[PDB]
Unconditional design. Structure first.
Length: 325
């Protein structure tokens, strides 16, 4: 089934998604200009056909640049590349959804995105600020209306600006909001959430699977562990003894074991690397497979704890992480 040259899996709207892509979030402060563009190019040369991005990562112009260069030289056609962009919290107001997607299209200089997803279920104060809190540091929460925001998303697909629609960081209750929606035109095909062997998302995955929603594993290698936003209490994922042990068995790194685990069970992974060797390393996951014994054993590593808990927002009506799943 899955191979380096062919590893796209079905989405419920008849489209398909490469089961591995390149993540592109990088701390703007300490990232060299051009590093994203260079990485996307290397990834495409390597065999990646899926790139995950977001306007708020401040490098979507580099993503577009890289994709267009590869199309221009004839490495890929547009239809061979799958780009996922994201609608941020400050742009949830229905009237803003389309202009927000149009900005991303203009930044990429592309005609459409393959997947456009609601970044988080929480709405913030609209404005030239990505993360708006007041002087006292109170997160200016805007009133969320997910159904109305989703309707604006649907109109974007109707207009042909995007092939597939999805969400990110949505719990069961939030997905059911959309799924049960009166007059639902386009159901979510994708839910992008933290996922890896310390958090196999067993319940959310079964639930998503019942509705033909595909899970995309963000931070599939356990994040870069930046303390200013990541929960550095847990030990680094790539140090797990089991994962490293299985690595030895297959002559593979802990990262490659981690990625293989998630794809082998139909979860899309979007590991981020701006390093030449590691970009290649992460893609080499089609020449082996894990035994049912091993898959079960890795699953069992499931802590049911999160590296990305977003505690600073736990007091938003739509905070997704309270429910069991
Ligand atoms: N929907 C959301 O809310 C959300 C949230 C977070 C992230 N995301 C998306 O998911 C993507 C990936 O998650 P993530 O960036 O947070 O973290 P990640 O992909 O799990 O891991 C990234 C970190 O691991 C390092 N790394 C990559 N490959 C490695 C390897 N083979 N061995 C050892 N280290 C390796 C990278 O450094 P180097 O670059 O130097 O290799 C980077 O520091 C993000 O870039 C973004 O696209 C989405
Ligand atoms: C946590 C943070 C706001 C949320 C950002 C985070 C960088 C990583 C990140 C990636 C996303 O795609 C969702 C939002 C987040 C989680 C930013 C770093 C500083 C700021 O406080
Ligand atoms: Cl946005």
């Amino acid at each position: 089934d899955l191979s380096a040259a062919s590893h796209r899996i079905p989405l419920s709207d008849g489209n398909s998604i490469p089961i591995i892509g390149l993540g592109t979030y990088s701390e703007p402060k300490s990232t060299p200009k051009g590093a994203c563009a260079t990485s996307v190019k290397v990834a495409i040369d390597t065999g990646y056909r899926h790139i995950d991005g977001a306007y708020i990562y401040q490098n979507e112009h580099e993503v577009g640049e890289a994709i267009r260069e590869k199309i221009a030289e004839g490495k890929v056609r547009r239809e061979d590349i799958f780009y996922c962009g994201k609608l941020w919290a400050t742009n949830h107001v229905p009237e803003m959804v389309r202009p927000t997607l149009e900005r991303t299209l203009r930044v990429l200089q592309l005609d459409y995105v393959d997947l456009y997803i609601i970044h988080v279920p929480m709405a913030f104060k609209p404005g030239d600020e990505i993360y708006p809190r007041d002087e006292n540091g109170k997160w200016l929460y805007h009133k969320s209306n997910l159904c109305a925001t989703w309707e604006a998303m649907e109109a974007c697909k109707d207009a042909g600006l995007v092939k597939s629609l999805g969400v990110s960081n949505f719990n069961r209750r939030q997905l059911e909001l959309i799924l049960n929606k009166p007059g639902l035109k386009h159901k979510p095909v994708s839910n992008q959430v933290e996922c890896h062997p310390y958090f196999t998302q067993p319940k959310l995955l079964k639930f998503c699977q019942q509705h033909d929603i595909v899970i995309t594993a963000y931070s599939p290698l356990g994040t870069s562990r930046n303390p200013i936003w990541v929960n550095v209490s847990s030990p680094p994922l790539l140090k797990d003894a089991l994962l490293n042990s299985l690595g030895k068995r297959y002559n593979k790194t802990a990262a490659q074991i981690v990625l293989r685990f998630n794809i082998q069970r139909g979860v899309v992974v979007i590991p981020k690397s701006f390093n030449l060797e590691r970009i290649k390393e992460n893609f080499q996951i089609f020449d082996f497979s894990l035994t049912e014994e091993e898959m079960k054993d890795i699953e069992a590593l499931n802590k049911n704890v999160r590296f990305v808990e977003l505690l600073m927002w736990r007091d938003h009506p739509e905070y997704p992480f309270h429910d069991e799943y």
